[PDB]
Every structure is written in structure tokens, then in C-alpha cells.
């Protein structure tokens, strides 16, 4: 039908997870740097 | 319904793939940043440097552990570190803060890890190879080396110590 | 008589599930280890033969991460394209796959059980285990080459019968799946024939450790996609039907597996970011390629989420979260792979950090890694397998599933899922706190005081997954016991998902069907990425004496 509002939010969660993981470790890499 | 959701679905699919290729790009540029700055020292040096492991604590800088800390520049010391059967040589490693400490590590037995707790120094130590990593300890105090590779039964007990002077 | 392929395919599963059952027993004891709790004198009482912590970790690593997953791959990715074509598999060769697999196991097993190959499932030289482990495993892994040929054969056979016609979906998946694996399996095959086997017999006395593990990780990464794609295949081709829905795109599924065929092998240096003697350049090249092989999964995240949504809609999907509660949360063949897919989000997020070269030194060889892949293989791949019984087991046997069996299935899966999550927080956290992996850390209690908080978590997951595991064996050893064969649903076809076709479902789908071309693109990319460095390492080979310290 019209506009997959659910699956968008699904890959939104995934996008937000990937970022926190990636940014979170980039911040830790720099403290140990 | 249905027939309608194949038109709309190849649109969102494309747009999501398009987004992702830039999200990943923005990582690649940031991975590159760390490669250009000073922090890139912890990456092992490429050029092979083989040794004889059985004859390493007799012949070569890994023999006399008092000679481990050797000045090799105006503000750069090299430390010849040995990763053996459940210990590290020397114990401890005394080095000055603010200086470029160039570690050179090898093994007379099996594969061990060199994980200096609180630093980015995490380098695999291989029998017959000289792992060359670079770090500048900014802050004085005691640091602790954990071995992070299964090296036999004593593995869990295999720790080292690095003292950075004041 | 009706279907002899059923028997091999079932026997693959049962033996796979035995391996799981055995390896996983060590799990809870190991989870309690990283909880600073020493349940290992307790383990000795149950199995006197368990000599050391790391003996278990080899067994738990081999049976679960290598054995069970390959057996399951060998069942799913052979049985499905077959039944989909209706054509019969070469049963002469299809029993050659299983028979190599059973003996090869037993040959490899005996050293390990006798504490003779306590070297872990990665077996990095100069760690020198018993010759029979090395041989048996070699044979077990070669069974897939029989499996490769078997599936390649039916493709060649169906290509004759229907000339010009596009390859049926599941077939296409399993063809490029077995092609990629062949091109990847070589690394370990090389390492085993040329280096492990001679060395272990006595033909040579040393091994160059760097190439030993370069050749290992050549195969070390595509092997994990060799465990995953079976689950993916089911998730693409059976789950949408299971949700009471459909598959939103045929090309996007075909594109996924295509991108895996291409990109799953020439990445293996991301395990060797710490390894000495490899140009940083080649690492940054493999770093970008690993992020590329991440694209196909992101694609999967969108095709499957939509499929699920679209299904939920049909069943009375409401608002934003309205379509989720519409999905059949009572059928455990649905519930299991979906909970695994939720867990696949943080695990996939972990996997991307791991691939960012410099950022690896933050987590490499710490507890972070166990926490990462248990959300991948022990969560998604394994829960899908457990779920692919409640729909596939009645198929092969003809035996029905009751109500308290089915309710046991929801209880087992939720507890197994809920345990891996608790364990993830634990290990990840402990990893960032610098706790190493592959360590009997409970023997040294005062050693990591800073991790007293995430340690409790691993204890909590220790008990939880224990209860889950028992509950599971009960369940499995309860369908296989009762004799109530009802051979109607035996003949009743597999729950294949309806697909959506369109006007442009042919252009790209035909472009992708050019397998022979892409396999030679696949072959070029491996050569281009692993060639210069492997050639380099061969020309400076430094073998070092064998060692045993257990
Ligand atoms: C099955 C098994 C595995 C999978 C899958 C897997 C995925 C990845 N891994 Fe990995 N891995 C690494 C990189 C990746 C990357 C980039 C991915 C990617 O393929 C992951 C991409 C995944 C995603 C981008 C997630 C997409 C999300 C999806 C698809 C779910 C959508 C959900 C839906 C649709 C449901 C929603 C439903 C509702 C109802 C709402 C790296 C480094 O680059 C290391 C080395 C670490 C070190 O230094 O030690 C590593 C370490 C390991 C080890 C340790 C081996 C050892 O002992 O040395 C194992 C066993 C393993 C297995 C697996 N790994 N990995
Ligand atoms: C009962 C549930 C399970 C628990 C509690 C558990 C726990 C653990 C823990 C804590 C480790 C890390 C130990 C260490 O590095 O010292 C580990 C290792 C591992 N597990 Fe599991 N596990 C479970 C199930 C599984 C399953 C089903 C699989 C197969 C898909 C699996 C595959 C692996 C692999 C590949 C390793 C790494 C072995 C190595 O480093 O050599 N686990 N397990
Ligand atoms: Cu040295 Cu573990
Ligand atoms: Cu990998
Ligand atoms: Xe092997
Ligand atoms: Xe193995
Ligand atoms: Xe094996
Ligand atoms: Xe192999
Ligand atoms: Xe491997
Ligand atoms: Xe692996
Ligand atoms: Xe392997």
C-alpha cells in the first residue's frame, strides 16, 4: 500500500545504533590516543 | 495495496542504499583522519623483520634485559620487549613521559598479545617476527600489559608492567 | 522411496544438533567464568575428562562455530534448491557429503576429547595439536566440496530442461552461495595441505605463523557468511510466508547474495589489523571492502522489515508499531528468526566498529568480540536453526507438532534470546574495560575489579541460558522419541513465500543471472586483494618449531 512507515523506523533504529556504537568507540579511541 | 508496494519499494530501497553509502563514507574519512594524526603509530609497521626465536635470548637485543631500554633519538627510546611463556621481559619497563616510545616485540615460543591497558597499543606478537608499534605516553604512572591471545595453560596469568617516569 | 534426499537432509540436521547440544554445555560454564564465578570443579564432576578450561573452549568452538553451522548450511542450502526445482539430488554424492562429514568429525574429535588438540577452533601455529584433529577437520571441511558439486549439478541439469528460462529464486541463492564458499574455502585448504598436515605428521618441523594465519583468515571471514546465508535464505524465502505475508522484491534478494559472492572473501585482513608484517595500505583497502560487504546486510534489513510490515498490515496492522503485534507471535518458527534479527542490529553495529581499522585496537581480542559474534551466530544463525525445525521437521519426517511442544518452543526461544542480550551487555562492557577473551579469568578473581558490574550480568546470563539449553534438549529429544508418523504433511510442500513481480523484474534479474561472469569477477577480486601480499610472504617464509603447553 502507501508508505512503509514501519520498516523506515526499523532502519532508523539500526542507523542510530550503528552511530552510537561507532561514535562511542571513536571517542574512546581518542582518549587512549 | 500490493501492486502499489513495488513502485514505492524500489524508491525507498534506492534512497536507503544511497544514504548508507555516504554514512559509510563519513566513516572512511574519519578512519583516514586517525591515520594521518599522531595516533596512527599503534598500527604495526609493514616491512617484515624476521628473527630466530630459539636463539633470541642469547643473540640479539632480546637477550640482555637490562639493555632493553635504548635511546635512539633526541626524544625517542626503543624498548626491546619479550613475550614468552606466561611473562614479559623486562618486568617492569621504565620509560619517560612525553617521549616517543617505539616498542619492538617478539616471541620465543607461541603467539601472545601486547595489550597496554589504557592505551591504543594492542599488537599481536608472533614467533619469528618483530612487531613495531609507536606510542607517546602523555601521563605518568603505572600501566599494565595484559596478554590477549591464547598462549597455553598459563595464559590468564600472563601480565606485564610498564612504568612511565615523571 | 518417495524422497531419499529427505534422509540425508534429516541426518545432517540431527548430527548438527548433537554437536550444538554438546558444545553449548560448556557455554554456561564459560559465561560464569566471565562472571568471576568458577563453576569448573562442578564441570569436572559431570565430565572427568575435561582437563582444562581451554579444552572446553576448543570443543565449544569447534562443535558449535564450525561443525553445527556447516552441517546446517549443508542441509538447508542443498535441500531447498532441490525441492524447489523438484529434481532429485545425486544421492550417491549426497551420502558422500554426510559420510565424509561423520567420519571426519570422529577422526578429529578423539584427539580433542583426549586433551590432545587443546588449541582452540582457530589453531594458530606454533600451537601444535594432535595430527588427527588436523586431518579429521580437513576432511569434514572438504565434505562441502561434494556439497558444492551436488548443487552445481542440479543447476546444470535444470539449465538443460528449461533453456533460456531464469533460475528459480532459492536455486539462484544456493548456487552463488556454494560458488563463493569454494573460492573462499581454499585459504584453509591451502594452509591445511601445504602447512598443517605435513608439519603435524613430521614432514616439516616448523611453520611460518604469519602466513598460517593469513591463509586462515582468507577463509576465516567468508566462513561466517557461509553460516549466515542459510538463515538469510530461509528469512527471505520462507519467513514472509510464515508471517502470513510476501517478499517485496525478488531482485533485491538476488542482489544481496550477488554482492556476497563478490565481496565476502577479499576482506580477511580485518582480522589482522594487529598482525605484524602487512602494509597498512592493504589493511585500509580491506577496511573499506569490509564496510562494502556490510551493504548487502543493510539491504536485507530493508527488504525483510518491509516484508514483515506488509504482512502485519494484511493481518490488521494498525499504526506505527501496530503492524508488529499483528505478526504471528505464537508460531515459534516465526518468532525465533525474528528475535534473532533484532539481536542482529547491535551485533551488526559492533561488526562495523570492528572493521574501522584503527578503531579495532580498542576492542581487538577483548571480551567485546565474544559479545559481538554471539549476537550474530549464536543469536541469529542459531535461533533461526531452532525455528527451522518447527516447520522443516514435520516436512522430513511427517510427524506433527502439538500444543505444549509449540508452547515450549516460544519459552525456549525467548529465554535463549533474552540470555544472549544480557550476555552481550556483559561481554561488550567487560571488553571496553580491557578484559581479554579466551581467558579463564575466574581463576584470577581480584584481577579485574573495575568490571564487577558487567560481571554480574554474565552470571545472570549464565543461569538464564543454562535453563534455556536444558529446556531445549528436552524438546528436541521428545519429537525424535515419539513414533506418531502422519505422512500427509510429509508430502505437503515447504512454506515457500509468494513474491512480487513487476515490469522491471527482468532487466536486473537477468543481468544478475550471468553467474559464470561474476564468479570470474569473484575470482579476480581475491587474486587482486590477496595476491601481492601472499606472494610477498611466501618469499620470506620463516618456519618456527611446534609447541604444546596444555
Ligand atoms: C554469523 C557470524 C558472523 C556475522 C554475521 C558477522 C558479521 C560481521 N562481522 Fe564478524 N567480525 C568483524 C566484522 C564483521 C562485519 C563488518 C560484519 C557485517 O556483516 C555485519 C553487518 C550487519 C548489519 C549491517 C546489521 C543489519 C541488520 C539486520 C539485517 C537486521 C534487520 C532487522 C529486521 C528486519 C527485523 C526487525 C523486525 C521487527 C519486527 C521490528 C571484524 C572486523 O572487521 C571482526 C574482528 C574483531 C577482532 O579484531 O577480533 C569480527 C569478528 C568475528 C568473530 C571472531 C572470530 C575469532 O574468534 O577470531 C566471529 C565468529 C564473527 C562472526 C560473524 N560476524 N565475527
Ligand atoms: C549457552 C549459550 C552460550 C553461552 C553462555 C556461550 C558463552 C561463551 C563465552 C562467554 C565465550 C567466550 C569465552 C572466552 O573467550 O574465554 C564463548 C566462546 C565462543 N562461542 Fe559461545 N556461548 C553459547 C553458545 C554458543 C553457540 C550456540 C555457538 C555457535 C553458534 C557459540 C560459538 C562460540 C564461538 C565461535 C566462541 C569463540 C571460541 C574461541 O574464542 O576460540 N557459542 N561462548
Ligand atoms: Cu601470552 Cu596469552
Ligand atoms: Cu571477518
Ligand atoms: Xe584444519
Ligand atoms: Xe576445526
Ligand atoms: Xe571437526
Ligand atoms: Xe580444508
Ligand atoms: Xe577458517
Ligand atoms: Xe572463524
Ligand atoms: Xe576454520
CATH number, position C377:
1.20.210.10
The phi and psi torsions of B99 (rounded to 5 degrees) equal -100, 155
Tell me: do B89 and B143 sit in the same domain: yes
Q: What is the CA radius of gyration of chain A?
A: 15
Q: What is the CA radius of gyration of chain C?
A: 23
Tell me: do B11 and B85 sit in the same domain: no
Q: Put the strands of the sheet holding B112-116 in their side by side order.
A: B93-95, B159-164, B141-146, B112-116, B122-125
* Number of domains observed in the structure of chain C: 1
Task: Using CB atoms, pick whichever of B13, B31, B123 lies closest to residue C302.
Answer: B13
**Which residues, in sequence order, are CB contacts of C477 under 8 Å at separation 6+?**
none
Tell me: do B37 and B3 sit in the same domain: yes
C-beta separation of C56 from C481 below 8 A: no
> Is residue C189 in contact with ligand 8, taking CB distance under 6 Å?
yes
Q: Is C40 left (phi over 0), alpha (psi -120 to 50) or beta?
A: alpha
Rounded-to-integer distance, Cα C108 and Cα C66, Å: 12
Which residue range forms the structural domain that includes residue C173? Answer: 1-550
Q: Tally the residues of chain B.
A: 166
Helix-strand-coil split of chain B, %, nearest 5: 25, 35, 40
Q: How far is CA C91 from CA C3, C6, C153, C176, in A?
A: 10, 10, 12, 22
Q: What is the CA radius of gyration of chain B?
A: 22
Helix (H, G, I), strand (E, B) or coil at C88: coil
C-beta separation of C419 from C464 below 8 A: yes
Rounded-to-integer distance, Cα C244 and Cα C327, Å: 8
Alpha helical stretches, state H, A1-33: 5-32
Which residue bears the cell 565434505? C143
Helix (H, G, I), strand (E, B) or coil at B135: strand
Task: Tell me whether residues B39 and A30 touch, CB distance under 8 A.
Answer: yes
Q: Is C428 one of the catalytic residues?
A: no
Strands (E), C189-299: 206-207
> Is residue B112 in contact with ligand 3, taking CB distance under 6 Å?
yes
Question: Which ligand sits closest to the CA of C69?
Answer: 2
Cα(C126) to centroid of ligand 2, in Å?
23
Tell me: do B143 and B158 sit in the same domain: yes
C-beta separation of C343 from C420 below 8 A: yes
Which residue bears the cell 552461495? C177
Q: Give the CA angle between residues B2, B7, B12 to the nearest 5°.
A: 110
Instruction: Give the gap in angstroms from C-alpha A26 to the nearest C-alpha of chain C.
Output: 7
C-beta separation of C273 from B122 below 8 A: no
Tell me: do B29 and B101 sit in the same domain: no
Residues facing residue B135 across a β-bridge: B101
In this structure, what C-alpha cell is assigned to residue C351? Answer: 561488526
Short-list B152, B70, B75, B84, CA closest to B114? B84
Residues facing residue B77 across a β-bridge: B71, B101
Rounded-to-integer distance, Cα C417 and Cα C409, Å: 12
Rounded-to-integer distance, Cα B152 and Cα C115, Å: 13
Could you count the other beta carbons within 10 Å of the beta carbon of residue C99?
14
Rounded-to-integer distance, Cα C333 and Cα C348, Å: 23
The phi and psi torsions of B161 (rounded to 5 degrees) equal -140, 135
Burial class (CB in 10 A: 0-12, 13-18, 19+), C481: exposed
Rounded-to-integer distance, Cα C123 and Cα C128, Å: 8
The phi and psi torsions of C408 (rounded to 5 degrees) equal -70, -35
| Chain C CB within 8 Å of residue A23 CB | no
Which DSSP string do the residues of C467-535 spell out, in sequence order? HHHHHHHHHHHHHTT-----THHHHS---PPPB---SSTTHHHHHHT-HHHHHHHHHHHHHHHHHHHHH
**Which residues, in sequence order, are CB contacts of C240 under 8 Å at separation 6+?**
C246, C247, C307, C308, C311, C497, C498
C-beta separation of C70 from C382 below 8 A: no
C-beta separation of C51 from C115 below 8 A: yes
Which protein residue's CA is at the shortest distance from atom 1 of ligand 7?
C137
Rounded-to-integer distance, Cα C381 and Cα C374, Å: 10
Rounded-to-integer distance, Cα C435 and Cα C474, Å: 35
C-beta separation of C357 from A23 below 8 A: no
User: Is C271 annotated as belonging to a binding site?
Assistant: yes
The phi and psi torsions of B83 (rounded to 5 degrees) equal -110, 105
Tell me: do B38 and B69 sit in the same domain: no
Neighbours of A, requiring at least 3 CB pairs below 8 Å, are B, C
Element (H, E) at B23: helix B7-36
> Is residue C59 in contact with ligand 7, taking CB distance under 6 Å?
no
Strands (E), C62-183: none
Which residue bears the cell 608499534? B133
Short-list B30, C347, C295, C298, CA closest to A23? B30
Rounded-to-integer distance, Cα C115 and Cα C94, Å: 33
Q: Which pairs count as long-range contacts for C463-467, CB under 8 Å and 24+ apart, including other chains? A: C463/C28, C464/C415, C464/C418, C464/C419, C464/C422, C465/C27, C465/C28, C465/C31, C465/C415, C465/C416, C465/C419, C465/C420, C465/C423, C466/C28, C467/C415
C-beta separation of C262 from C525 below 8 A: yes
Indicate the Cα dihedral angle C93, C98, C102, C104, nearest 10°: 50
Which DSSP string do the residues of B33-92 spell out, in sequence order? HHHHSGGGGGSPPSS--B--STTTTTSSTTS-GGGSEEE-STTEEEEEEEEETTEEESSS
Q: Is C221 one of the catalytic residues?
A: yes
In this structure, what C-alpha cell is assigned to residue B116? Answer: 597496554
Short-list C255, C337, C503, B15, CA closest to A3? B15
C-beta separation of B78 from B102 below 8 A: yes
Which residue bears the cell 553467474? C515
Rounded-to-integer distance, Cα C264 and Cα C268, Å: 9
Tell me: do B140 and B70 sit in the same domain: yes
Rounded-to-integer distance, Cα C207 and Cα C248, Å: 51
Helix (H, G, I), strand (E, B) or coil at A33: coil
Rounded-to-integer distance, Cα B165 and Cα B141, Å: 7
Burial class (CB in 10 A: 0-12, 13-18, 19+), C274: buried
Chain B residues with CB under 8 Å of a chain A CB are 1-2, 4-5, 8-9, 12, 16, 19, 23, 27, 30, 34, 37-39, 118-120
* Number of domains observed in the structure of chain B: 2
Which residue range forms the structural domain that includes residue B119? Answer: 45-166
Tell me: do B38 and B109 sit in the same domain: no
Rounded-to-integer distance, Cα A23 and Cα A28, Å: 9
Short-list C453, C451, C464, C392, CA closest to C422? C464
C-beta separation of C266 from C529 below 8 A: yes
Return the DSSP state at B3: G
User: Is C60 annotated as belonging to a binding site?
Assistant: yes
Element (H, E) at C544: strand C544-545
Q: Are strands B76-84 and C206-207 parallel, antiparallel or unpaired?
A: unpaired
Q: Tally the residues of chain A.
A: 33
Rounded-to-integer distance, Cα B44 and Cα B131, Å: 6
Tell me: do B21 and B82 sit in the same domain: no
Maximal CA-CA distance, chain B: 79
Cα(C388) to centroid of ligand 5, in Å?
29
Task: Tell me whether residues C120 and B150 touch, CB distance under 8 A.
Answer: yes
Return the DSSP state at C268: G
C-beta separation of C49 from C104 below 8 A: no
Contacts with B36 from chain A: Cβ below 8 Å: none
> Could you say which residues from 9 to 28 on chain A have a Cβ atom under 8 Å away from some Cβ of chain B?
11, 15, 18, 22, 26
Element (H, E) at C422: helix C404-432
Peptide bond preceding B27: is omega within 30 degrees of 0, i.e. cis? no
Rounded-to-integer distance, Cα C20 and Cα C33, Å: 20
Cα(B134) to centroid of ligand 1, in Å?
30
Instruction: Give the gap in angstroms from C-alpha B23 to the nearest C-alpha of chain A.
Output: 9
Q: Is C438 one of the catalytic residues?
A: yes
Helix (H, G, I), strand (E, B) or coil at B115: strand
B61 CA to centre of own chain: 20
User: Is B112 annotated as belonging to a binding site?
Assistant: yes
Q: How far is CA C228 from CA C29, C60, C281, in A?
A: 26, 19, 29
Rounded-to-integer distance, Cα C214 and Cα C194, Å: 14
C206 CA to centre of own chain: 32
> Could you say which residues from 77 to 116 on chain B have a Cβ atom under 8 Å away from some Cβ of chain C?
85, 109-111, 113, 115
**Which residues, in sequence order, are CB contacts of C491 under 8 Å at separation 6+?**
C2
Rounded-to-integer distance, Cα C75 and Cα C119, Å: 28
Q: Is C130 one of the catalytic residues?
A: no
Cα(C237) to centroid of ligand 3, in Å?
45
Most A CBs within 10 Å: which of B7, B32, B34, B137, as the mutation test of the A interface?
Answer: B34
In this structure, what C-alpha cell is assigned to residue C532? Answer: 601481492
Rounded-to-integer distance, Cα C68 and Cα C385, Å: 10
Rounded-to-integer distance, Cα C272 and Cα C364, Å: 10
Rounded-to-integer distance, Cα C211 and Cα C533, Å: 10
Which protein residue's CA is at the shortest distance from atom 32 of ligand 2?
C65
Among B12, B27, B44, the domain boundary falls at B44
| CATH at residue B4 | 1.20.1070.10
**Taking each helix axis from N to C terminus, what angle separates C251-263 and C169-190, rounded to the nearest 10 degrees?**
10
In this structure, what C-alpha cell is assigned to residue C345? Answer: 542490529
Rounded-to-integer distance, Cα B118 and Cα B132, Å: 19
| Chain A CB within 8 Å of residue C310 CB | yes
Rounded-to-integer distance, Cα B32 and Cα C280, Å: 12
Burial class (CB in 10 A: 0-12, 13-18, 19+), C52: middle
C-beta separation of C375 from C418 below 8 A: no
Rounded-to-integer distance, Cα C332 and Cα C388, Å: 9
Element (H, E) at B124: strand B122-125
Method by which the model was determined = X-ray
Instruction: Give the gap in angstroms from C-alpha C463 to the nearest C-alpha of chain B.
Output: 24
User: Is C364 annotated as belonging to a binding site?
Assistant: no
C-beta separation of C175 from C183 below 8 A: no
In chain B, which residues are followed by a C-to-N distance beyond 2.5 Å, i.e. a gap? none
In this structure, what C-alpha cell is assigned to residue C394? Answer: 514435520
C-beta separation of C231 from C73 below 8 A: no
Q: Give the CA angle between residues C220, C224, C227 to the nearest 5°.
A: 135
| Residue positions of B annotated with a catalytic role | 84, 86
Short-list C127, C211, C546, CA closest to B129? C211
Return the DSSP state at C547: B
Tell me: do B36 and B68 sit in the same domain: no
Element (H, E) at C134: helix C131-161
In this structure, what C-alpha cell is assigned to residue C397? Answer: 519426517
Which DSSP string do the residues of C7-26 spell out, in sequence order? HHHHHHHHHHHHHHHHHHTH
Alpha helical stretches, state H, C293-331: 295-314
Could you count the other beta carbons within 10 Å of the beta carbon of residue B26?
12
Rounded-to-integer distance, Cα C198 and Cα C152, Å: 31
Return the DSSP state at C366: B
Could you count the other beta carbons within 10 Å of the beta carbon of residue C122?
17
Neighbours of C, requiring at least 3 CB pairs below 8 Å, are A, B
| CATH at residue B96 | 2.60.40.420
Short-list C456, C430, C434, C412, CA closest to C24? C412
Task: Tell me whether residues B12 and A2 touch, CB distance under 8 A.
Answer: no
Cα(C276) to centroid of ligand 2, in Å?
27
Element (H, E) at B95: strand B93-95
Amino acid at each position: 500500500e502507501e508508505k512503509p512507515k514501519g520498516a523506515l523506523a526499523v532502519i532508523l533504529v539500526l542507523t542510530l545504533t550503528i552511530l552510537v556504537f561507532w561514535l562511542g568507540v571513536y571517542a574512546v579511541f581518542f582518549a587512549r590516543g | 495495496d500490493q501492486h502499489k508496494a513495488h513502485k514505492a519499494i524500489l524508491a525507498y530501497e534506492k534512497g536507503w542504499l544511497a544514504f548508507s553509502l555516504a554514512m559509510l563514507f563519513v566513516f572512511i574519512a574519519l578512519i583516514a583522519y586517525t591515520l594521518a594524526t599522531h595516533t596512527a603509530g599503534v598500527i604495526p609497521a609493514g616491512k617484515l623483520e624476521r628473527v630466530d626465536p630459539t636463539t633470541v635470548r642469547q643473540e640479539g637485543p632480546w637477550a640482555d634485559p637490562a639493555q632493553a631500554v635504548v635511546q635512539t633519538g633526541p626524544n625517542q627510546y626503543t624498548v626491546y620487549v619479550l613475550a614468552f611463556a606466561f611473562g614479559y621481559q623486562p618486568n617492569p619497563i621504565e620509560v619517560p613521559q612525553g617521549a616517543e616510545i617505539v616498542f619492538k616485540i617478539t616471541s620465543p615460543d607461541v603467539i601472545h598479545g601486547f595489550h597496554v591497558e589504557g592505551t591504543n597499543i594492542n599488537v599481536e606478537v608472533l614467533p619469528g617476527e618483530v612487531s613495531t608499534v609507536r606510542y607517546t605516553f602523555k601521563r605518568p604512572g603505572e600501566y599494565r600489559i595484559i596478554c590477549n591471545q591464547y598462549c597455553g595453560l598459563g595464559h590468564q596469568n600472563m601480565f606485564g608492567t610498564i612504568v612511565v617516569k615523571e | 522411496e518417495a524422497y531419499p534426499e529427505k534422509k540425508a537432509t534429516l541426518y545432517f540436521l540431527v548430527l548438527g544438533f548433537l554437536a550444538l547440544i554438546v558444545g553449548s554445555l560448556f557455554g554456561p560454564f564459560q559465561a560464569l567464568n566471565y562472571g568471576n564465578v568458577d563453576a569448573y570443579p562442578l564441570l569436572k564432576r559431570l565430565l572427568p575428562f575435561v582437563q582444562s578450561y581451554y579444552q572446553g573452549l576448543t570443543l565449544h568452538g569447534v562443535l558449535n562455530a564450525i561443525v553445527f553451522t556447516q552441517l546446517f548450511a549443508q542441509a538447508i542450502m542443498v535441500y531447498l534448491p532441490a525441492r524447489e526445482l523438484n529434481m532429485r539430488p545425486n544421492m550417491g554424492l549426497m551420502w558422500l557429503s554426510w559420510w565424509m562429514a561423520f567420519i571426519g568429525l570422529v577422526v578429529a574429535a578423539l584427539p580433542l576429547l583426549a586433551n590432545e588438540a587443546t588449541v582452540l577452533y582457530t589453531f594458530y601455529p606454533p600451537l601444535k595439536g594432535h595430527w588427527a584433529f588436523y586431518l579429521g577437520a580437513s576432511v569434514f571441511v572438504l565434505s562441502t566440496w561434494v556439497s558444492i558439486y551436488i548443487v552445481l549439478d542440479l543447476w546444470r541439469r535444470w539449465k538443460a530442461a528449461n533453456p533460456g528460462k531464469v533460475t528459480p529464486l532459492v536455486t539462484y541463492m544456493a548456487v552463488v552461495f556454494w560458488l563463493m564458499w569454494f573460492l573462499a574455502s581454499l585459504g584453509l585448504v591451502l594452509e591445511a595441505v601445504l602447512f598443517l598436515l605435513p608439519w603435524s605428521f613430521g614432514l616439516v618441523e616448523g611453520v611460518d605463523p604469519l602466513v598460517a594465519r593469513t591463509l586462515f583468515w582468507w577463509t576465516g571471514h567468508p566462513i561466517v557468511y557461509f553460516w549466515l546465508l542459510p538463515a538469510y535464505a530461509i528469512i527471505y524465502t520462507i519467513l514472509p510466508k510464515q508471517a502470513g505475508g510476501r517478499l517485496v522484491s525478488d531482485p533485491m534478494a538476488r542482489l544481496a547474495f550477488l554482492l556476497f559472492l563478490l565481496l565476502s572473501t577479499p576482506v580477511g585482513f580485518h582480522h589482522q589489523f594487529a598482525d605484524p608484517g602487512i602494509d597498512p595500505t592493504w589493511k585500509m583497502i580491506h577496511s573499506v571492502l569490509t564496510l562494502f560487504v556490510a551493504v548487502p546486510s543493510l539491504m536485507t534489513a530493508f527488504t525483510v522489515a518491509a516484508s514483515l510490515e506488509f504482512a502485519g498490515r494484511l493481518r490488521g496492522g494498525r499504526g506505527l508499531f501496530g503492524w508488529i503485534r499483528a505478526l504471528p507471535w505464537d508460531n515459534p518458527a516465526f518468532v525465533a528468526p525474528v528475535l534473532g534479527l533484532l539481536g542482529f542490529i547491535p551485533g551488526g553495529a559492533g561488526g562495523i566498529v570492528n572493521a574501522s581499522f584503527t578503531l579495532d585496537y580498542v576492542v581487538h581480542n577483548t571480551a567485546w568480540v565474544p559479545g559481538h559474534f554471539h549476537l550474530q551466530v549464536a543469536s541469529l544463525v542459531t535461533l533461526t536453526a531452532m525455528g527451522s525445525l518447527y516447520w522443516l521437521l514435520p516436512n522430513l519426517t511427517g510427524k506433527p507438532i502439538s500444543d505444549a511442544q509449540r508452547r515450549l518452543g516460544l519459552a525456549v526461544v525467548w529465554l535463549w534470546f533474552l540470555g544472549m542480550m544480557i550476555m552481550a551487555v556483559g561481554l561488550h562492557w567487560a571488553g571496553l574495560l580491557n578484559v581479554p577473551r579466551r581467558a579463564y579469568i575466574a581463576q584470577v578473581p581480584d584481577a579485574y575489579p573495575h568490571a564487577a558490574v558487567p560481571m554480574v550480568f554474565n552470571v545472570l546470563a549464565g543461569i538464564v541460558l543454562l535453563v534455556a539449553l536444558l529446556l531445549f534438549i528436552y524438546g528436541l529429544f521428545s519429537v525424535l522419541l515419539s513414533r506418531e508418523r502422519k505422512p500427509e504433511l510429509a508430502e505437503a510442500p515447504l512454506p515457500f513465500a509468494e513474491v512480487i513481480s513487476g515490469p522491471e523484474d527482468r532487466r536486473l534479474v537477468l543481468a544478475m543471472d550471468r553467474i559464470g561472469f561474476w564468479f570470474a569477477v569473484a575470482a579476480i577480486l581475491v587474486v587482486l586483494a590477496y595476491g601481492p601480499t601472499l606472494v610477498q610472504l611466501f618469499g620470506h617464509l620463516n618456519p618456527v618449531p611446534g609447541w604444546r603447553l596444555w
